[PDB]
Amino acid sequence: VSTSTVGARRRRAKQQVDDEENATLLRLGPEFALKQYDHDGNEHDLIALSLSESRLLIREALKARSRARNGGVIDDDELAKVTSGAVANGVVKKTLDYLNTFARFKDEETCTAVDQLLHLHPFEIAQLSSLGCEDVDEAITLIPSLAAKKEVNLQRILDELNRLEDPY
Amino acid sequence: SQFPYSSAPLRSVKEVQFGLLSPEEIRAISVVKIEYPEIMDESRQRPREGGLNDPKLGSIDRNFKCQTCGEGMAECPGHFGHMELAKPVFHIGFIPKIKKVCECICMNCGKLLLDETNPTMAQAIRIRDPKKRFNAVWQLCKTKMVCEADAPSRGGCGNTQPVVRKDGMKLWGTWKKSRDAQPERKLLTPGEILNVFKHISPEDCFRLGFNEDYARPEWMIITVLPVPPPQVRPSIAMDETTQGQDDLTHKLSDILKANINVQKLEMDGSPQHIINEVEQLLQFHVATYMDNDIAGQPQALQKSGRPVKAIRARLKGKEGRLRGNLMGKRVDFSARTVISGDPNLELDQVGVPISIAKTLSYPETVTQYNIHRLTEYVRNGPNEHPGAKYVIRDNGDRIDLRYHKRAGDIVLQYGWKVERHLMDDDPVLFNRQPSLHKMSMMAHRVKVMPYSTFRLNLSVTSPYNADFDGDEMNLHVPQSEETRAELSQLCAVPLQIVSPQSNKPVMGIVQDTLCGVR
Amino acid sequence: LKHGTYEKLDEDGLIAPGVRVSGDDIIIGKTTPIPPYHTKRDASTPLRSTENGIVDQVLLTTNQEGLKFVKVRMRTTKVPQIGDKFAS
Amino acid sequence: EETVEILFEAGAAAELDDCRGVSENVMLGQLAPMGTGAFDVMIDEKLLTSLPADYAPT
Amino acid sequence: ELAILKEERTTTPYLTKYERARILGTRALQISMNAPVLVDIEGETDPLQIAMKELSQRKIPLVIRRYLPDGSYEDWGCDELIVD
Amino acid sequence: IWGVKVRLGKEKDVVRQILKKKLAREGTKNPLEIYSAFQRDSFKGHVYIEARKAEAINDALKGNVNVFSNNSKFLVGIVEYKDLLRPVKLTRGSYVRVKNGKFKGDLAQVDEVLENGLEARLKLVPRLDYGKDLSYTSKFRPAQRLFSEAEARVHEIRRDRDGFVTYGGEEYYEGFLYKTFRLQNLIVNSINPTLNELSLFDPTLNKTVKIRQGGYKGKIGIVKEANGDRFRVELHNPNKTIPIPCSFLLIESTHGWVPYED
Amino acid sequence: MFFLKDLSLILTLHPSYFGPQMNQYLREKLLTDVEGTCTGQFGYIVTVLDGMNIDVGKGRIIPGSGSAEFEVKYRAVVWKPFKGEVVDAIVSNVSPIGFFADVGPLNVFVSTRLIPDNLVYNPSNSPPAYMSNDELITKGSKVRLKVVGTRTDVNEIYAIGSIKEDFLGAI
Amino acid sequence: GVIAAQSIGEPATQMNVTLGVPRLKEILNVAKNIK
Amino acid sequence: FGEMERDCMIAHGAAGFLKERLMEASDAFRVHVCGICGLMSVIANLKKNQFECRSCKNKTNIYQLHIPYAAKLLFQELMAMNIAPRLYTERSG
RNA sequence: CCUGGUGUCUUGGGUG
DNA sequence: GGATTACACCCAAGACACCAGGCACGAG
DNA sequence: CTCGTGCCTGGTGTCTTGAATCC
Ligand SMILES: [Mg+2]
Ligand SMILES: [Zn+2]
Ligand SMILES: [Zn+2]
Ligand SMILES: [Zn+2]
């Protein structure tokens, strides 16, 4: 039905088992290669999004479109009624509410601070932001790929994440 | 539109990749293994599973749905089976190429007899066309009469190579054992050659002009036979309740019987000289199943005495699949009758008999501008002219106006189609055989007339090389809005008055009118 | 069964002389039983689709093998018209 | 000519047919790149915008 | 990429007989499926006639994509090509 | 031992002919110097001949019309001899497939064998009609169904024992036919049970019409099609079928041509 | 796991839709057909970016049928989960065979043989929960699980989790 | 292409050096030994 | 509609007419192909709306084609002689 | 109360 | 050694054999 | 009533030796 820029995938003589999606082994399949191409043929890094980025973009896109539907005229339950159809109403409401209960940095002030702090494979950089951690010991266990990289700063990463983190 | 809706995207064909079917792939697309030559269960209706008419292969009967795709016989394409061969046999089409490969490679390990160190040979691998490269290589290596263990180690085995000769369906290799001594030529069985071919390296596979993904060289030996569905070999009823089978059906039974007897040998009484007679016979049946015009040996015969119609003979010649059904074919919406002349018709008109005009039709789409006009045709029905034969809905269901007794209760919706009768000024393509040049096919405007001949204005007899001594001509009716416009704006008679053949007209005033005008 | 009319056959399965026939009309009714009621299959002969005329004469006899055997001759008249061919 | 031989030889050497000829497309029943088929026809979205607003798709 | 800019178009500015036939047929077809017609329809109500009327007034809303041998192409609108 | 190719089906004849030649020449100055000859059914189209010299093989076959004239004889190895002469089941309670008669192809249980050892009593699902059309072949037989003695009682029978009836001179015990077959008439090897065995074990059309108004007034015809109001009469007089309105017709009935009161 | 993907959809347009607001109809048409749908190749398509400004290109007319074919290139927010990815969740159901957890659009099933023995299902408690002493798994409790297998139905995808490992569970 | 083929073939169908159809045949068949 | 009538329509340049004659007005047939292996091996149940090329384990990359029935027949006869005619819908160079 | 299948392979004689 | 040898169309005129086994009928 | 012979049906399987040019 719907297709992408990546095409053909004609048969090759040697098979491959670096295709099976394994986040531990950095296998994201043929569609989510490290170097993608946009609809003009230009090269582009894979766009993986943390929970904090994603909350701003999706909410902005929905209210800008909602304003556009109103000729140019906050709460998650109100923002999800913009969609068309009960099937669409469901998936969008559940995604905001899920993000509403797990996004630490729920505003653009803190988020841009986290954005500048983080901006080396692009997938790992996005993983560190999504999974909250206390110490260096907790990060290399649950995410065993950070082992043999020999470039920490990790502690100051976690300290800034936890300091920017508002109380609850 | 005659096809029910399917969500799969519609695309056109841009490339045809030819190649060979691997043994593994044949099994992957097969839906059943074929073992028993008895077609019927026990002559008590319903054909035997695992037999040659196993219902998983498909339906050629209007009342049994396919047990694989659920579709009716019209839509169901048929699905292949497979038949395992007890012993690998040669493909009859590829023997002379197999023979060529033997003189190129080592008959022990299978490596190309020459390297890039040889200057002329290094030039030959650069040749871009695979066929010419393969021939250029073989032209060099032909005279190399021993596989060297050592460079001129290259991976060689040191053995001298035989001179392989073809003797019918058998290949003989004569090895020169190390002046002159005694050489012993033994038969090079398919199984022996099969194992040798699987050990050819990927790098030498490419240099031989073969292709690792599409045409791997051991796939020229047949180990499992694809069983075509019944659509390829339909049954026919000679005198209603008596049906004979297609030549392929009988021939596949013979291969299947012969396959069982090879299994019947290796487990008990094999006097060796019997194994060679039974294996060669399996090779024979598989060969004449594909090609029954093998030079130098008698043809396989039916019990009626006439030769078996092999697959190769199905495709060649004037009546075969290519020249008889694809480069040309029989077509709908055509008509033919004797022609007569009429001076009181315009140059671009053709007089069309009423009976022909009621049989042919054009599907005119219903719009706001013609809906009132088209309803009048519907009331008149198929037997009064000007009338109509069918009303086609957007779903495709046709209403046959011969049998619709409540014809007065039809209301037409926009977007429907009415197949109305042929009517005045419709363009049609007119044609007389033999079509020697482009003005053998010109578009004329219909004028419906009584009597059963086609009428032509006399000045068009010359480009058709027609006269009225018994000649017949053909009429073709375009079936859509796009082709009507193509006919009137490209092929119409007045556009054809001057021909590019000799930059001069091909029509003039002729016969009576020319005599009289002087 | 065939799509044409069977109403010109008499009870003996044969049409009688003097009856006009048109295309696809059945003129000889014959059945064949279906092997293993409602057991037979039609094997009848219709008049050629492009023709018409009058049944002129019907021969009934048996052949060398002793089964029944019929011939039906149809006559019509062809009147010259546009398109017919002539020669000195 | 040499119909079956061409096709056997084509298989054994894995020939690619790029479908640019007239004959290729005719036998596959596709619009051939010749005459009225030698180009594509696109819809002029720019010229449609000069129509009035009551003609608009909803 | 393949598209050639408007200022650098090199193919002939006259509508060919083949382009004309395809345009008339395609537009005719669309009208019979009840596409909005861009000219006044008086007495001439045949689909082909309406399409021929639109052509004569330079009002057919279609673009010719003329393929060149290498695969590149020049898009020409039927509004700008000169019809004899 | 040499093998020789012979016409299919003529192997026994060739063995016979060789024996006659051998016996006829015994003790003469030109004896046939072969020892034996034989033909194995499993080895179609071959005869084997025992001798010391190849010339004796040619001598044995000279003039034999069943032998292929090509110099096709082949030598057998000593290590292959005994296999040429290898001579090669059936137990009560086991299944076999019948090879002859209306029960051809049917699965049957072996009930018992004759004392002599030739025919075996088989237990079979019957194919009967209960004499329904009496005043059989394998192509015009009946479906299989267990014998029903009450159906036989009703429709057409001798009781012999508990659950045992003789019906039309065949024996049925607890619904099964018990019938003797030659052992050569059953298949005991490589039987494949089937799926089925696993489950078991308008009133004026075509009437003659006269036309009473119009240009065709007085002509005979037949109603070919009567969809509505407009009829299709196949006129007799010219070879044409016309469309005609219903007001214009007279229909034939018991008494003359009757208007639309029929 | 969220990504931004540049996608495209082939749209066929009937000729009766050839009016001055054609592009705006197509923009509405794209959104109705794509938003909220799932595919095994990309995951759930959550929202499309910059919907009212998408450049649809030119439509190819299909020979012989009159209808027009647009290739609408676009950019969307997509959500696909992955095997090996550790994620948080909100439990939707608790049953004798494990629990079901809503991670945004879909639901993940964790079976009993991959749950530690000390977490005991307690129906008598009010409200029902998986309980310990300093642990509390009620509906809405943050839990940390790891996706160990993805199965594809091409309509909705199904992922199976596990809490049979270190540092996974309630926090 | 096709126009060229028909333009040359059609006159041939109605038609001491060799001329007419036998000479035409030598050309297309580019025979090494002409008559 | 023989070989010589085919040539006349080419000379007229009436490509659209020639396509219709040899398809819609005759033996037009719809087939399904696998986008990966290019064979006509797709098993298509249209009322259940489920498609699968078992060889490629592919239920998503599948296309439909309109080709002559006699061409479909031709390819099945070629398959029966171990020739693989792979129909791809895109070029690659 | 809508759907609705009648053969093939040759050979010979003819038409333009 | 094979392959090449105009196009389309009409219509009338034809079809497995031999051997073995089983069943039925007639005669003793 | 039993045995033998003849006819019909079904199943399985081949073989005495006997138009011309071109590439
Ligand atoms: Mg003439
Ligand atoms: Zn099917
Ligand atoms: Zn070697
Ligand atoms: Zn595939």
The two tokens of residue A130 are 């999504």
| Burial class of residue G72 in the structure, from the number of CB atoms within 10 Å of its CB (0-12 exposed, 13-18 middle, 19+ buried) | buried
Rounded to whole angstroms, the Cα distance separating E60 from E22 reads 12
What kind and span of H or E run contains E20?
Answer: helix E17-32
Q: Where are the alpha helices (DSSP H) in chain G?
A: 22-34
- The CATH number of the domain holding residue A106 is 1.20.1250.40
Q: Are B269 and B278 in contact (CB under 8 A)?
A: no
What are the DSSP calls for B376-415, one per residue? Answer: HHHHH-TTSSS-EEEEE-TT--EEETTT-TTGGG--PPTT
Rounded to whole angstroms, the Cα distance separating F254 from I73 reads 61
The two tokens of residue B70 are 């659920």
Cβ of E18 under 8 Å from any chain I Cβ?
Answer: yes
| Burial class of residue C33 in the structure, from the number of CB atoms within 10 Å of its CB (0-12 exposed, 13-18 middle, 19+ buried) | exposed
Question: Considering CB atoms only, which of G3, G82, G140 is closest to A49?
Answer: G3
The two tokens of residue F48 are 């084997």
Beta bridge partners of F133: none
3-class SS string, B14-30: CEEEEEECCHHHHHHHC
Phi, psi dihedral angles at D54 (to 5 degrees):
-75, -5
Report CA dihedral (B34, B40, B46, B51) to the nearest 10 degrees.
0
* Topology of domain G83-171, CATH: OB fold (Dihydrolipoamide Acetyltransferase, E2P) (2.40.50)
Please give the method by which this entry was determined. Answer: cryo-EM
- From chain B residues 455-514, the ones with a CB under 8 A of any chain H CB are 500-501
Spell out which residues of chain B touch residue F228, defining contact as CB-CB under 8 Å. Answer: 405, 407-408
Q: Are residues A59 and A35 in the same domain?
A: no
B392 CA – J4 C1', rounded, Å: 19
Q: Are F121 and C17 in contact (CB under 8 A)?
A: no
Q: Are residues F19 and F57 in the same domain?
A: yes
Q: Are residues A25 and A36 in the same domain?
A: yes
Q: Do the chains contact at I86 and B79, CB–CB below 8 Å? A: no
Rounded to whole angstroms, the Cα distance separating H26 from H9 reads 15
Q: Are residues A155 and A130 in the same domain?
A: yes
Its domain, for residue F68, covers 1-86
CATH superfamily of G1-82: RNA polymerase Rpb7-like, N-terminal domain (3.30.1490.120)
- In this complex, which protein residues place their C-beta within 7 A of any atom belonging to strand K? B 238, 293, 295-296, 303-304, 318, 328, 330, 336, 433-434; D 1-2; F 100-101, 182, 185; I 2-4
**Residues for chain D: how many in total?**
58
- I35-71 burial, b for 16+ CB within 10 Å, e for fewer? bbbbbbbbbbebeeeebbbebbebeeebbbbbbbbbb
Cβ of F81 under 8 Å from any chain B Cβ?
Answer: no
Nucleotide nearest to B471 (CA to C1'): J16
Q: Are residues A116 and A135 in the same domain?
A: yes
Spell out which residues of chain B touch residue G10, defining contact as CB-CB under 8 Å. Answer: 9
Q: How many domains does chain I have?
A: 1
Q: Which residue has the tokens 């007239």?
A: D22
Handedness of CA F177, F178, F180, F186 (dihedral sign): positive
The terminus-to-terminus CA distance of chain F in angstroms comes to 98
Phi, psi dihedral angles at B54 (to 5 degrees):
-50, 125
Q: Are B169 and B287 in contact (CB under 8 A)?
A: yes
- Min distance G34 CA to chain E CA atoms (Å): 27
For residue I40, the ligand closest to its alpha carbon is 4
Q: Are A132 and A161 in contact (CB under 8 A)?
A: yes
**Residues for chain I: how many in total?**
93
The two tokens of residue B346 are 């315009």
Give one word for G98, left, alpha or beta, with left for phi > 0 and alpha for psi -120 to 50: left
Residue F109: how many CB atoms within 10 A of its CB? 16
3-class secondary structure, G104? coil
Residue A48: how many CB atoms within 10 A of its CB? 21
* I90 occurs within a structural domain: no
The two tokens of residue B87 are 């012993």
Cβ of B151 under 8 Å from any chain I Cβ?
Answer: no
Rounded to whole angstroms, the Cα distance separating I63 from I40 reads 10
The two tokens of residue F121 are 């009593």
- Measure the CA angle with vertex A11, ends A8 and A14; round to 5°: 135
- F254 CB-near residues (< 8 Å, 6+ apart): none
Q: Write the DSSP symbol of residue C68.
A: E
Residues around ligand 1, an ion, CB closer than 5 A:
B 467, 469, 471
Cα B169 to chain center, whole Å? 27
Every domain of chain G with CATH number 2.40.50.140 lies at 83-171
Q: How many helices (H) and strands (E) does chain E have?
A: 2, 2
Q: Is the peptide bond before B434 cis (omega within 30 degrees of 0)?
A: yes
Which residue type is seen at D35? G
Q: Are B483 and I13 in contact (CB under 8 A)?
A: no
- B339 CB-near residues (< 8 Å, 6+ apart): B453, B454, B455, B456, B466, B468, B471, B472, B473
Q: Are residues A88 and A9 in the same domain?
A: no
Closest CA to G99 of G145, G135, G166: G145
3-class secondary structure, A11? coil
Chosen from F239, F240, F241, F242 to mutate, greatest number of chain C CBs within 10 A: F239
Cβ of F100 under 8 Å from any chain C Cβ?
Answer: no
Q: Do chains C and H touch (3 or more CB pairs under 8 A)?
A: no
Beta bridge partners of B334: B476
Which chains pack against H, by 3+ Cβ pairs within 8 A? B, I
CA atoms within 13 A on the CB side of B134: 20
3-class secondary structure, B298? coil
- The CATH number of the domain holding residue I43 is 3.90.1800.10
Q: Are residues F80 and F178 in the same domain?
A: no
Rounded to whole angstroms, the Cα distance separating D57 from G18 reads 7
Q: Write the DSSP symbol of residue B422.
A: P
What are the DSSP calls for I57-74, one per residue? Answer: TBSSSEEEEEEEHHHHHH
- From chain G residues 76-95, the ones with a CB under 8 A of any chain I CB are none
Q: Are I17 and B483 in contact (CB under 8 A)?
A: yes
Q: Are A46 and A34 in contact (CB under 8 A)?
A: yes
Strand B334-341 and strand B454-456: the pairing is parallel
The two tokens of residue F72 are 């096709």
Q: Do the chains contact at B212 and A13, CB–CB below 8 Å? A: yes
Every domain of chain G with CATH number 3.30.1490.120 lies at 1-82
Rounded to whole angstroms, the Cα distance separating G59 from G11 reads 9
B299 CA – J9 C1', rounded, Å: 18
Chosen from A79, A89, A91, A128 to mutate, greatest number of chain G CBs within 10 A: A91
Q: How many helices (H) and strands (E) does chain G have?
A: 1, 14
Q: Are F222 and F207 in contact (CB under 8 A)?
A: yes
Does B69 carry a binding-site annotation? yes
Chain L bases closer than 7 angstroms to a protein Cβ = 9-11, 13-17, 22-23
Nucleotide nearest to B62 (CA to C1'): J5
Long-range pairs of G151-159 with CB within 8 A, sequence gap ≥ 24: G152/G40, G153/G40, G154/G39, G154/G40, G154/I59, G154/I60, G155/G38, G156/G38, G156/G106, G157/G38, G157/G40, G157/G43, G157/G80, G157/G81, G157/G106, G158/G106, G158/G109, G159/G81, G159/G83, G159/G106, G159/G108
Q: Are F113 and F183 in contact (CB under 8 A)?
A: yes
Residue B63: how many CB atoms within 10 A of its CB? 7
Phi, psi dihedral angles at F227 (to 5 degrees):
-60, -60
What are the DSSP calls for B456-507, one per residue? Answer: E-GGGHHHHT--SSS-EEEEE---SHHHHHHIIIIIBGGGGSEETTTTEES-
Spell out which residues of chain B touch residue H13, defining contact as CB-CB under 8 Å. Answer: 436
Which residue type is seen at A86? A
- Min distance E35 CA to chain I CA atoms (Å): 21
For residue B25, the ligand closest to its alpha carbon is 4
Q: Are E2 and E73 in contact (CB under 8 A)?
A: yes
Q: Which residue has the tokens 């029989």?
A: B330
CATH for E1-84, among 3.30.565.10, 3.40.50.620, 3.90.940.10, 3.30.420.340? Answer: 3.90.940.10
Q: Is the peptide bond before G127 cis (omega within 30 degrees of 0)?
A: yes
- Nearest residue to K9, CA vs C1'? B472
Strand G106-111 and strand G157-162: the pairing is parallel
Q: Are B121 and B134 in contact (CB under 8 A)?
A: no
The terminus-to-terminus CA distance of chain A in angstroms comes to 45
Rounded to whole angstroms, the Cα distance separating F3 from F54 reads 11
Q: Are I59 and I52 in contact (CB under 8 A)?
A: yes
Report CA dihedral (B320, B321, B324, B326) to the nearest 10 degrees.
-160
Rounded to whole angstroms, the Cα distance separating D25 from D35 reads 14
Q: Do the chains contact at B241 and C32, CB–CB below 8 Å? A: yes
Rounded to whole angstroms, the Cα distance separating D21 from D24 reads 5
Q: Are B345 and B460 in contact (CB under 8 A)?
A: no
Q: Are residues A157 and A146 in the same domain?
A: yes
Q: Which residue has the tokens 């799969």?
A: B8
Beta bridge partners of C62: C68
Rounded to whole angstroms, the Cα distance separating B496 from B439 reads 7
- Min distance G75 CA to chain D CA atoms (Å): 22
Its domain, for residue A12, covers 1-48
What are the DSSP calls for B90-120, one per residue? Answer: E-TTTHHHHHHHHHHS-TTT---S--TTSHH
Q: Do the chains contact at D45 and G17, CB–CB below 8 Å? A: no
| Burial class of residue A164 in the structure, from the number of CB atoms within 10 Å of its CB (0-12 exposed, 13-18 middle, 19+ buried) | middle
Q: Write the DSSP symbol of residue B437.
A: S
Q: Where are the alpha helices (DSSP H) in I2-52?
A: 3-12, 15-22
Q: Ligand 4 centroid to I39 CA: how many Å?
A: 6
Q: Do the chains contact at C35 and F206, CB–CB below 8 Å? A: no
Q: Do the chains contact at A13 and B9, CB–CB below 8 Å? A: no
Which chains pack against I, by 3+ Cβ pairs within 8 A? A, B, D, E, G, H
Q: Are B72 and B65 in contact (CB under 8 A)?
A: yes
Q: Are residues F178 and F212 in the same domain?
A: no
* I93 occurs within a structural domain: no
Q: Are G121 and G94 in contact (CB under 8 A)?
A: yes
Cα B487 to chain center, whole Å? 30
Q: How many domains does chain F have?
A: 3
Closest CA to F44 of F80, F86, F84, F8: F8
Rounded to whole angstroms, the Cα distance separating B401 from B382 reads 7
The two tokens of residue B80 are 């292949």
Does B54 carry a binding-site annotation? no
What kind and span of H or E run contains F174?
Answer: none
Rounded to whole angstroms, the Cα distance separating E27 from E21 reads 10
- Measure the CA angle with vertex E45, ends E42 and E50; round to 5°: 85
Closest CA to B486 of B427, B435, B441, B420: B427
Handedness of CA I8, I14, I18, I19 (dihedral sign): positive
Closest CA to B401 of I27, F234, F225: F225
Rounded to whole angstroms, the Cα distance separating A104 from A141 reads 22
What are the Cα distances from residue I34, in Å, to B21, B67, G40? 15, 21, 17
Rounded to whole angstroms, the Cα distance separating B452 from C82 reads 7
Question: Considering CB atoms only, which of B367, B482, B486 is closest to E34?
Answer: B367
Beta bridge partners of G147: G161
